[PDB]
Design a protein around this nucleic acid. Structure first.
Ligand SMILES: [Zn+2]
Ligand SMILES: [Zn+2]
Ligand SMILES: [Zn+2]
Ligand SMILES: [Zn+2]
Ligand SMILES: [Zn+2]
Ligand SMILES: [Zn+2]
Ligand SMILES: [Zn+2]
Ligand SMILES: [Zn+2]
Ligand SMILES: [Zn+2]
Ligand SMILES: [Zn+2]
Ligand SMILES: [Zn+2]
Ligand SMILES: [Zn+2]
Lengths: 61, 60, 61, 60, 61, 61
RNA sequence: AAAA
């Protein structure tokens, strides 16, 4: 399972992820927790509850 | 369930939540009610029944 | 079920519901019928048969 | 099942239907057939096979 | 059903079909294979694996 | 019969240079490292991208 | 990221 091992790894290491949204929007932060439908991203120190259906890509480097 | 937990909590505390839509529209309001498919958001007094498929992000 | 209770109500009382679409379009009319997949809105001299997947929000003002 | 009955009506009577698409685009024609996932719309003398997921509204 | 019948005929006849995408883009080509979820389309000299969820319409010419 | 999983495994095994087109018109060239039912991991321009399939229109080779 |  690539999705979970990936999110798990982002979460455990607290890596700075860039999240790209379907509509073109992007946001950088840290994944704090996630389940099947949502991802909780801490960005600019503030919490965001994001639906996976709204997400295109997670990017890191 | 992370989703239900957060919605449960926004509702209990009648907190003013910002809801972003897929299309980039954004609406500010309080969660009154929600189910497996919809969110009820009171904004400027008026109720809005929103489908979850149309929602991008909740923030505060 | 929130959705199903709200639509039953819109329908029973013949309220002038405004429907917003995912792509931001906006339609205003009376809900005459609905099932798991579609809503039927008698708008301005036309019957509109709408898919729920295309709906963003119902409101009334 | 409002959907299937509506479509059966459109097909049986060859009623002029305007199909509106998610992206706002629109097309008028006669429904020649349909199944669970698609609608066969004849428009300007050409067959169109449309996915229901692409459709926002049917208007008559 | 309607779908499988149409795609099978596109495939067996090597019909040049136009694929319209949800975002308006369009591609012209021949259908090499398809399954429940994807359509393989030869177009502009290249191979394409298209998701049905992104397809809006097929038409011939 | 399962075109999608056959193609992805080929892309991964042969390290084919794949262009991923997204529903929102944007596109990304690279190589597939991992995929599963819901996501694809695409190495491109030095970056790891984790892309949701629901956000993908087409793979082009 | 405000449904013009
Ligand atoms: Zn969802
Ligand atoms: Zn409002
Ligand atoms: Zn839905
Ligand atoms: Zn924010
Ligand atoms: Zn109208
Ligand atoms: Zn639908
Ligand atoms: Zn046409
Ligand atoms: Zn579909
Ligand atoms: Zn799909
Ligand atoms: Zn990149
Ligand atoms: Zn998905
Ligand atoms: Zn191409």
């Amino acid at each position: 399972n690539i999705q979970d091992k990936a999110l798990e790894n982002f979460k455990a290491n607290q890596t700075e992820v860039t999240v790209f949204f379907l509509n073109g929007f992007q946001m950088k932060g840290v994944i704090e927790e996630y389940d099947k439908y949502v991802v909780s991203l801490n960005s600019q120190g503030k919490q965001h509850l994001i639906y996976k259906h709204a997400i295109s890509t997670y990017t890191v480097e």
